[PDB]
Design a protein around this ligand. Structure first.
Ligand SMILES: Nc1ncnc2c1ncn2[C@@H]1O[C@H](COP(=O)(O)OP(=O)(O)OP(=O)(O)O)[C@@H](O)[C@H]1O
Ligand SMILES: O=c1[nH]c(=O)c2nc[nH]c2[nH]1
Ligand SMILES: O=c1[nH]c(=O)c2nc[nH]c2[nH]1
Ligand SMILES: [Ca+2]
Ligand SMILES: [Zn+2]
Lengths: 362, 96, 184, 145, 48
């Protein structure tokens, strides 16, 4: 009657954890199915309408069925890995903080703060009633007592770790055990440590994989609001496959260097914009009809926009797009301008960035 | 090539000690061997501070080793620097 | 210096080990001031040398300009260091750095908001989590676990984890809102 | 079999020029370079397809009006009024293009979504043309080497 | 010489432990320390 419910959730057996990978690949396959269904959308006509260019007569209800199934499977996914790997993360964090307390004494003497978010969160969990819930050593608090009682203040350590100074010592002095069972009313309700669940929820929210699963679930939810949000789930195959993970990590592998090189490209293009603004302004007419001239370099911001967007993307550079210099007084100066732009921006810096990415991958 | 030269400059410090040139693995046979050899036994800052101490100390009060190093520093003879040898390397025979 | 020399020259002596144990505080205090090197002694043997390192020397070595000079020196010698020229360059750098320290002594005379926002967000989210884990509604929900079957508990478990997911999405989103507000 | 089919159609004898690839050692190495990293090549091509599909989704939802490929104003030829057509256009034209899809779709100047489309095109050029295509080419070249 | 339990063998052959072992091996070969190698090994052993 009340041997039930709890053991019974346990009859759920963490089956989500057991088939978490199977369930994840089911979600990936459902994402494939939904996004292949999306390929037959079309626009009909004010306000446009997205209607299915469909001929079999079956593709409309299966879209909603698959969206609901994907949302349910992703919710089961986030219940999984919380049944499965969250205890491992909690155990690792508890072990790390316990070793820091014992061998290093970080909170006894060092007191790390203001820089290590893990540090403050572990400080928050230090004084919990059940600190080593997943850690095997339930006596870390009393070991820290034995190590630092005479140095740092016996009572100060007692109130820092949140122990009762006499509970266990008189427990071992005299047996005096009173019966207690979890089947009693309100016992399970009050057997939950608010600060410990605080810390557990905080660290699992900090966890990267949990955040990725949360994003997956949130976009699976938003797919009902707009079916095109299910397209973001095709990126999951990049994490699923090893080589695609390497391709993704190649961008971040040299991120500082890539950002600095992009900044250098921006600076040199800005210099070229300055030169064109001061001298070669008349060459930047991008109008076919003579009545309405469309100058791209009458404004500094517009000139910088044009140089970036068109010259950097162009095969030969800005000179293949701006007016020819033949017959003008500044012919040689503009020829040098375009040749140097092509050599530095297109030939070198873009190749520098591409080589950075390729070499990171390699 | 410039990038690889910088990487090799960085790596070569961990591979060998600057003063003696002995490979790091011999030190690492003892745990933290490189971290002790480079910081206490053969340290660039320590050698520079020794040179400054020799300059600041009066020649009359120089000890035997201090006078030896002073002579060879004035004569620009750098044989006092341990070339391919260390304390533990030299005392592997008797001490070890 | 005497104790360190004796300890390093006769490691296998418990009688000296006792003296080192009783002098542990002296040696611990003197560690920043004791400088130890190795030289090629006149007796054709490698010999330890102990000397004094001044606090002013330590500070002026830790000064940034000396650090940059040291980085340039190290980079250059590893690139284009000579066979015998290595230690000649080293001693030239040592002399230049000694002068640099003298000049530096002459010249010298005499994020977290986001972390706290996340802290508060988690605090009130967990407050809500325990408050409906302990509400009178859940305290009365014990009649359904009488007419309990399996469907009631399936619904209850799904609702509980669904509310946990709601608290999670209130979090992170609140952190982003606060971060954007504080930065702009 | 192709020598037999050459009598049915003489152009089937053109397939026999591929025999020199097996006859010569270096050409055999060139052919085997494709298969040497076949799994990785297939996965990279799949990643390229996925990212182009994401770009098609974005263009379909927001930048649809920019995909007119008609010179005459009477008959507009939209390449992104259909999801399949938009994916076809993005692959076939953008991936093959030197600068990407932006060198082929309409200019963004003066529009409300100017900056958004500029970011769209710049990111497309950076990821598809500059990185992923170079990733595939480097895979093949490194397999050969 | 010691005893290895069948339950231990099965739970070692279980896939999640295998993935953890792969990650551990990849990480230690990349950024393994001089003395930190076996400390990381025993930390992984406790986690596993
Ligand atoms: N003689 C030596 N003195 C100091 N470090 C040495 C020596 N030989 C090798 N090393 C190695 O050099 C590294 C120490 O860093 P490095 O020499 O670049 O600068 P540093 O003086 O420690 O200062 P910083 O870290 O501020 O640059 C370590 O890997 C150490 O093992
Ligand atoms: O660099 C140096 N600075 C000095 O002051 C000095 N005196 C002797 N030798 C010296 N070398
Ligand atoms: O990882 C561990 N798990 C344990 O249960 C344990 N007990 C002692 N030491 C232990 N280590
Ligand atoms: Ca004397
Ligand atoms: Zn050395």
């Amino acid at each position: 009657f009340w041997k039930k419910i709890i053991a019974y959730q346990q009859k759920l057996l963490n089956y989500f954890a057991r088939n978490f990978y199977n369930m994840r690949m089911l979600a990936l396959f459902v994402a494939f199915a939904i996004n292949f269904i999306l390929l037959f959308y079309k626009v009909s006509t004010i306000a446009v309408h997205y209607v299915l260019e469909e001929s079999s007569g079956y593709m409309e209800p299966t879209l909603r069925i698959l969206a609901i199934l994907h949302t349910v499977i992703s919710f089961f996914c986030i219940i999984g890995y919380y049944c499965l790997k969250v205890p491992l993360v909690i155990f690792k964090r508890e072990k790390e903080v316990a070793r820091k307390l014992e061998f290093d004494g970080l909170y006894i003497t060092e007191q790390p703060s203001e820089d290590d978010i893990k540090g403050q969160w572990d400080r928050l969990v230090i004084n919990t009633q059940s600190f080593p819930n997943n850690y095997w050593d339930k006596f870390v608090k009393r070991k820290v007592m034995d190590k630092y009682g005479e140095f740092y203040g016996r009572d100060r350590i007692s109130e820092l770790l949140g122990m009762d100074k006499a509970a266990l010592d008189f427990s071992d002095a005299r047996e005096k055990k009173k019966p207690k069972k979890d089947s009693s009313l309100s016992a399970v309700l009050n057997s939950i440590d608010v600060k410990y669940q605080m810390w557990k929820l905080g660290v699992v929210f900090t966890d990267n994989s949990f955040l990725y699963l949360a994003w997956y679930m949130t976009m699976s939810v938003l797919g009902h609001y707009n079916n095109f949000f299910f397209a973001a789930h095709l990126l999951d195959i990049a994490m699923g496959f090893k080589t695609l993970r390497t391709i993704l990590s190649s961008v971040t592998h040299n991120g500082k260097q890539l950002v600095l090189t992009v900044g250098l490209l921006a600076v040199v293009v800005y210099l070229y914009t300055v030169v064109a603004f001061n001298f070669f302004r008349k060459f930047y007419n991008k109008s076919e009809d003579g009545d309405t001239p469309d100058m791209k370099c009458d404004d500094m911001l517009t000139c910088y926009m044009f140089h970036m967007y068109v010259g950097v993307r162009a095969g030969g550079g800005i000179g293949d797009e701006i007016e020819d210099p033949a017959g003008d007084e500044y012919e040689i100066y503009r020829i040098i301008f375009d040749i140097t732009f092509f050599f530095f921006v297109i030939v070198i810096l873009l190749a520098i960035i591409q080589g950075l990415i390729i070499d990171a991958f390699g | 090539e410039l990038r690889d030269q910088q990487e090799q400059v960085k790596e070569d410090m961990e591979t060998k000690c600057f003063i003696c040139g002995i490979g790091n693995d011999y030190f690492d046979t003892v745990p933290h061997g490189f971290e002790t050899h480079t910081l206490q036994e053969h340290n660039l800052a320590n050698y520079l501070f020794f040179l400054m101490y020799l300059i600041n100390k009066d020649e009359t009060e120089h000890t035997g080793q201090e006078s030896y190093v002073w002579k060879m520093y004035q004569e620009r003879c750098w044989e006092f620097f341990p070339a391919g040898d260390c304390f533990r390397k030299q005392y592997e025979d008797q001490l070890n | 210096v005497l104790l360190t020399n004796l300890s390093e020259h006769m490691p296998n002596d418990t009688r000296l080990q006792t003296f080192l144990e009783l002098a542990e505080s002296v040696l611990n205090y003197f560690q920043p001031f004791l400088g130890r090197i190795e030289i090629m002694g006149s007796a054709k043997r490698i010999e330890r040398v102990y000397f004094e390192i001044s606090e002013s020397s330590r500070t002026q070595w830790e000064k940034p300009q000396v650090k940059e000079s040291k980085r340039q020196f190290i980079f250059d010698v590893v690139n284009e260091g000579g066979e015998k020229e290595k230690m000649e360059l080293f001693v030239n750098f040592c002399e230049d750095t000694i002068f640099e320290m003298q000049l530096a002594a002459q010249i010298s005379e005499s994020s977290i908001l986001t972390v706290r926002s996340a802290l508060f967000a988690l605090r009130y989210n967990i407050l809500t989590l325990m408050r409906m884990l302990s509400l009178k509604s859940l305290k009365k929900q014990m009649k359904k676990v009488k007419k309990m079957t399996v469907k009631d508990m399936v619904t209850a478990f799904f609702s509980s984890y669904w509310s946990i997911f709601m608290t999670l999405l209130h979090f992170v989103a609140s952190v982003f809102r606060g971060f954007f507000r504080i930065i702009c």
